[PDB]
Enzyme design. Structure first.
Site, short mmCIF file in Angstrom:
data_model
loop_
_atom_site.label_atom_id
_atom_site.label_comp_id
_atom_site.label_asym_id
_atom_site.label_seq_id
_atom_site.Cartn_x
_atom_site.Cartn_y
_atom_site.Cartn_z
N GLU A 1 0.81 -1.21 0.00
CA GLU A 1 0.00 0.00 0.00
C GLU A 1 0.84 1.26 0.00
OE1 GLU A 1 -2.84 -1.14 3.37
OE2 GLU A 1 -3.80 -1.38 1.38
N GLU B 1 -4.02 -10.56 -0.33
CA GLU B 1 -4.95 -10.40 0.79
C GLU B 1 -6.37 -10.67 0.28
OE1 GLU B 1 -2.30 -6.54 2.36
OE2 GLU B 1 -4.45 -6.54 2.79
N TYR B 2 -7.05 -11.65 0.89
CA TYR B 2 -8.47 -11.94 0.60
C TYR B 2 -9.19 -12.50 1.81
CZ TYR B 2 -8.07 -17.12 0.00
OH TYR B 2 -7.84 -18.47 0.21
#
Ligand SMILES: OC[C@@H]1[C@H](O)[C@H](O)[C@@H](O)c2nnnn21
Ligand SMILES: [Mg+2]
Ligand SMILES: [Mg+2]
Ligand SMILES: [Mg+2]
Ligand code: NA
Ligand code: NA
Ligand code: NA
Ligand code: NA
Lengths: 1011, 211, 170
Positions: free
Chosen positions: B69, B145-146
């Site tokens: 991010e 990421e999930y």
């Protein structure tokens, strides 16, 4: 902290790099590029003092001027003022190799300036100082308070002084270190100097200001439409009323204009850049920029308020052009370039590495006049003006970052070390941020010779990501690494492979087709122009034309790095490495230029000029085929000039305008050429003349030429029967031969024509003897020194084989009187340690016409190194004013470098027949000469020759030109054959096979007469 | 990068590791303000180069990651290449700036749905099944990421694993995340209770979003 | 110099990064991965004192212990001992967004440790200290003199102490 010994500290408090600013407060001034009041030169008289180390500098210097300090000019390199010595070293570092440490005895230059600052500059706004070039690192104080630190001696360091300045009088204190950790990245083959060597200045910007701006130009398929994209960035306080206007001007004609508030498009999950804005302008049928036609527009970026009030203006010249690689070729505006390039160091013989406008324009002119179209900033970003001039005059530029680590073992030790990545990056990124808007920059370069390391990969990618408008190249680590969009070898030969381990230099023609290789090839360095060089230059240029993916190269290099010294009397001379007490040094390796330091042409230049011609020619019977090699321009300032001359005597001459489209052809039909009666060779000589003056040349400038041999009438008429008969005077010691007032004497113990008389007057000062050797050229020596013998250099083969020692042993000296002549027959043998090197079998025939026909037959031992020459020499008593020959000229030309010379009747003063190379060597030769006239003397045949006041021996034994003394009389060398001069590089034998003298049995004849 | 023993433990117990550089600039506007800034290249590079220099010898490390991010910036591009150049034995991934930029060998989106598209401007999250076959796309897709396991969650988990199984180029993902980041506090009786954001006077805070 | 507010300085005198070392002087020990005498843990009890900013650290603390200081276990986060409040935040930075600057009020943790060093470790060879993780930056002193600075709270910062240590008490 010792910041100059830490490659993690490259700077402190330094402002961000950006393109050139002026902070104009009037858009009209910005548009017209007039001076800005907001930009002040601090150039002029400064206060300077030298110290042996930064520890030796007194605390008092921060606060007030040192009584011991002198008053000097800035910019300057301080070794040009005499404080310490400039060092010339090539590869080996001038400091101990111990990264990141420099010597504790680190010459420290203390500069200071007391100067005025007006009240209005401090009441509001930002005032910064800009140091364009400081070698190699420095700390800076303003009025005693400490400001910042900086490195990278070839890009501007800037600092905000707003808070440090007061109204009226202020004082700068700049501490400049000669050596720093930055030095390890600055090992270019040049002089090692230092100081504040580029401009200094003050720039006032408003609080709310343009901090940065990029210009981009995209094109539809045919370049009949373009979009100009202008990204603008700002510092200060964002307001809804702030506006940016970009206007594009061509002369006085507003072509386009756009206005937007600040606020960029969404780029990610967190929004966009609110301190940026991008303007897009349509431009229909744009006039495209090239080195052929450097069409320019002007961009004005105005930072303003909604209601129309200008805050500040910035501008730049814009050249509409696309650079891309496609299917293996480098395209400029969709057309494949042919880079007639040259490397150019920033060098002046009086001021050092300090550049000034005048010399730059002088270089550019001279370059363009000699058919160059590209330049390489070897090996650092240049003085900012240089880019403006190349934008305007029209030269393609390769902008190179200031990284070279040649002396490292192995070459990439640093550039593969991640701890050095930050220091490297700032040298690349800050160059890009500076020069990215200059249209003349078409290729970025990651630096010079630092092998190949992970850091090069990171940084290559960084540029590609940031500026896809330009290709990136890099030679380090084998010229074809994953860090290069271009195979850019240095000194790769045309046909010959040189498979060095790990980093081979392949033949360029072979390199292209290696399995899976697709990239273009443009040598970053080729044709080493050291002393008498540039031999076999024509071979490259033939290859460049035949091979699409071979798109040229950059000659090494533009200008001799010779500095000016003075003798006892005040007389000036050209100095190279060693001449300043510099040691270790690398002697005359700093002088490799197509021109002398003062910008006088070396003889090689004309060879470059000819090979780099933009017009090609073919001859079919009497049709001339003119082919243009221009990409964009029509031949709209060009006329063809033709003449046909019989052994120098002009028969028919003519003039036809050229009307050739780029890449086009034009056929010119020569009128019936009226065939003459007498004996001789007919020659055709075309030249391309430019009727009109241009920005870079005068009216009548010649841009191209070529010759062809036409018809030949062989002489079949017998010389008018000799009325008289010459007389032999056999002695025990001499053969004397008498005819009228002419007398010839042959010595019988040596076997050579020892003396000659016209009346009572002696012609010779030393007898007519065979010569097999020459004063070694820089190319013959290579890297061989007195204590570093390279037995592979041509010179070292010659010495060890005895060529220079070998004395002639007489084998046979006989005389016979004939029906109309006296016939002398000699034979000689040169031996060394009982090995016979050469055999010379001659016959002199002096007939009653007073002519002496010499016939020479030389045998050379197959197992001895092929000799420099096979000729005769002698010291003439006469010292004449003019030399007159029929043959190749007018300039110096050698067998592997005579393409530029024309065959004609040439008449020059004697001094012209000597080329004053700073390192003296054999020089002045003219080839394919059939007739030579010197005062009373004439020689006829088909020979090579040189003619000067200096013996090969003097030339050999004198290290600098200025120590040469004119010898009594005139030295004359007449070669039946002469060896090529090499030049592909100057560190290993470079004379091609076809130019070496290896036949084993040679023949040449001479007619010596006094007409 | 983790506690050093963690790698020894994955080496020996057998877990595939993704080693991630200590770089995250989520808070910036836009997200790539620093990572696109060359003056920030130095700081970032040490965070990457030193990771590789420490951990390159562990068999459990199969993929390097450039961080998290931090949008997409030229610095990512530079470093990605750096890794590829120094250590070609491992693919490199990074999610920022759209999950499929030129700085990643693997399409590694975060919370991309199985069937439903989420066509956000500039940085869209496509359905993973559609993402694979976009014109010109050829890489494998593995979610970084999930399945956000926040509280009573992991609904729709079966859909992902059915999709992973059917599509060869859908090679899985990493659930978010392993452990609740709750801290221990004590009331007046010295009894322990699980605490989250704001429970320490910390403000502004994102309340339960740490668990 | 305020190195913690300058992204061009991320460390000073830090040693090159590298894989796990143990400097075994016995092949077998290295092979079987046994503990190494040349690798000493300094984990355990330390002397710690909190401050509200660095400018509030008294200059005496380099030279000798602070009486006000407590004894705490290392490694730890000092938030877990109660010296200030741990902050949970997701996107919004826990500090004002104004790069490269931080707040003037910068919670500063002062760690100290008195410890032995054997004669044989200084007679020859190299003696370094290894901080596997330090959040978020730190300056290091040894026996009063300054050694260096380090950033990146997730990789080990290493410093050569050879010329700082003295036999016995340090
Ligand atoms: O003129 C000497 C030249 C020059 O320094 C070049 O930059 C380099 O390619 C080189 N390598 N060996 N000799 N040179
Ligand atoms: Mg430094
Ligand atoms: Mg070099
Ligand atoms: Mg810092
Ligand atoms: Na070509
Ligand atoms: Na040179
Ligand atoms: Na799958
Ligand atoms: Na969370």
């Amino acid at each position: 902290r010792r910041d100059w010994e830490n490659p993690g500290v490259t700077q402190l408090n330094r402002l961000a790099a950006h393109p050139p600013f002026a902070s104009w407060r009037n858009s009209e001034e910005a548009r017209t590029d007039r001076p800005s009041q907001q930009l002040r030169s601090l150039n002029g008289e400064w206060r300077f003092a030298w110290f042996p180390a930064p520890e030796a500098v007194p605390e008092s210097w921060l606060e007030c001027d040192l009584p011991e300090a002198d008053t000097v000019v800035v910019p300057s390199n301080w070794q040009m003022h005499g404080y310490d010595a400039p060092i010339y070293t090539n590869v080996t570092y001038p400091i101990t190799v111990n990264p990141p440490f420099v010597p504790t005895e680190n010459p420290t230059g203390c500069y200071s300036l007391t100067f005025n600052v007006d009240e209005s500059w401090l009441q509001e706004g930002q005032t910064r100082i800009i140091f364009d070039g400081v070698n190699s690192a420095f700390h800076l104080w303003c009025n005693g308070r400490w400001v910042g630190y900086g490195q990278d001696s070839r890009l501007p360091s800037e600092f905000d002084l707003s808070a440090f300045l007061r109204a009226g009088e202020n004082r700068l204190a700049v501490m400049v270190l000669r050596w720093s950790d930055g030095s390890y990245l600055e090992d270019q083959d040049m002089w090692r100097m230092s100081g504040i060597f580029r401009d200094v200045s003050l720039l006032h910007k408003p609080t709310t200001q343009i901090s940065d701006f990029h210009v981009a130009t995209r094109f539809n398929d045919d370049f009949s439409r373009a979009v100009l994209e202008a990204e603008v960035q700002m510092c200060g306080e964002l307001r809804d009323y702030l506006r940016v206007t970009v206007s594009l001007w061509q002369g006085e004609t507003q072509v386009a204009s756009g206005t937007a508030p600040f606020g960029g498009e969404i780029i990610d999950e967190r929004g966009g850049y609110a301190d940026r804005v991008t303007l897009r302008l349509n431009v229909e049928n744009p006039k495209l920029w090239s080195a052929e036609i450097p069409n320019l527009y002007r961009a004005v970026v105005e930072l303003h308020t909604a209601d129309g009030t200008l805050i500040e203006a910035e501008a730049c010249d814009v050249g509409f052009r696309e650079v891309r690689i496609e299917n293996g070729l480098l395209l400029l505006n969709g057309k494949p370039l042919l880079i007639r390039g040259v490397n150019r160091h920033e060098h002046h013989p009086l001021h050092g590495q300090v550049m000034d406008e005048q010399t730059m324009v002088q270089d550019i002119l001279l370059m363009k006049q000699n058919n160059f179209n590209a330049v390489r900033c070897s090996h650092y970003p240049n003085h900012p003006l240089w880019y403006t001039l190349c934008d305007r005059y029209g030269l393609y530029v390769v902008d190179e970052a200031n990284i070279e680590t040649h002396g490292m073992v192995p070459m990439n030790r640093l550039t593969d070390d991640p701890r050095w990545l930050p220091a490297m990056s700032e040298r690349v990124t800050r160059m890009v941020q500076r020069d990215r808007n200059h249209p003349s920059v078409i290729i970025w370069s990651l630096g010079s010779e630092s092998g190949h390391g992970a850091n090069h990969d990171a940084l290559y990618r960084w540029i590609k990501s940031v500026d896809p408008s330009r290709p990136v190249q890099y030679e380090g680590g084998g010229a074809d690494t994953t860090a290069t969009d271009i195979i850019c070898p240095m000194y790769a030969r045309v046909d010959e492979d040189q498979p060095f381990p790990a980093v081979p230099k392949w033949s360029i023609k072979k390199w292209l087709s290696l399995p899976g290789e697709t990239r273009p090839l443009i040598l970053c360095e080729y044709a080493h122009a050291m002393g008498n060089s540039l031999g076999g230059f024509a071979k490259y240029w033939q290859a460049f034309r035949q091979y699409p993916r071979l798109q040229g190269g950059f000659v090494w290099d533009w200008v001799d790095q010779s500095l000016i010294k003075y003798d006892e009397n005040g007389n000036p001379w050209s100095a190279y490495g060693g001449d300043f007490g510099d040691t270790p040094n690398d002697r005359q390796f700093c002088m490799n230029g197509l021109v002398f330091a003062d910008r006088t042409p070396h003889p090689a230049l004309t060879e470059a000029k000819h090979q780099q011609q933009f017009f090609q020619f073919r001859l079919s019977g009497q049709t001339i085929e003119v082919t243009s090699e221009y990409l964009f321009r029509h031949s709209d300032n060009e006329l063809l000039h033709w003449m046909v001359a019989l052994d120098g005597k002009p028969l028919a001459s003519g003039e036809v305008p050229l009307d050739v489209a780029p890449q086009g052809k034009q056929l010119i039909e020569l009128p019936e050429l009226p065939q003459p009666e007498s004996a001789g060779q007919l020659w055709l000589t075309v030249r391309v003349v430019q009727p009109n003056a241009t920005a870079w040349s005068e009216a009548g400038h010649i841009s191209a030429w070529q010759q062809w041999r036409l018809a030949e009438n062989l002489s079949v008429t017998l010389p008018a029967a000799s009325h008289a008969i010459p007389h032999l005077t056999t002695s025990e010691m001499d053969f004397c031969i008498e005819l009228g007032n002419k007398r010839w004497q042959f010595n019988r113990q040596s076997g050579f024509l020892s003396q000659m008389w016209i009346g009572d007057k002696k012609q010779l000062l030393t007898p007519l003897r065979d010569q097999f050797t020459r004063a070694p050229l820089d190319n013959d020596i290579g890297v061989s020194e007195a204590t570093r013998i390279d037995p592979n250099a041509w010179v070292e083969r010659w010495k060890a084989a005895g060529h220079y020692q070998a004395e002639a042993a007489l084998l046979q000296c006989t005389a016979d009187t004939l029906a109309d002549a006296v016939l002398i027959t000699t034979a000689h043998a040169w031996q060394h340690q009982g090995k016979t090197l050469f055999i010379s079998r001659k016959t002199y025939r002096i007939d009653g016409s007073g002519q002496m026909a010499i016939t020479v037959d030389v045998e050379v031992a197959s197992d001895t190194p092929h000799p420099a020459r096979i000729g005769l020499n002698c010291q003439l008593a006469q010292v004449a004013e003019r030399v007159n020959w029929l043959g190749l000229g007018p300039q110096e030309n050698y067998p592997d470098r005579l393409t530029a010379a024309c065959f004609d009747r040439w008449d020059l003063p004697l001094s012209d027949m000597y080329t004053p190379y700073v390192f003296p060597s054999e020089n002045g030769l003219r080839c394919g000469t059939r007739e030579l006239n010197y005062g009373p003397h004439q020689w006829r045949g088909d020979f090579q020759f040189n003619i000067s006041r200096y013996s090969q021996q003097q030339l050999m034994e004198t290290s600098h030109r200025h120590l040469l003394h004119a010898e009594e009389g005139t030295w004359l060398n007449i070669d039946g054959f002469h060896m090529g001069i090499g030049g592909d590089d100057s560190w290993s034998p470079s004379v091609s096979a076809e130019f070496q003298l290896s036949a084993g049995r040679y023949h040449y004849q001479l007619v010596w007469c006094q007409k």
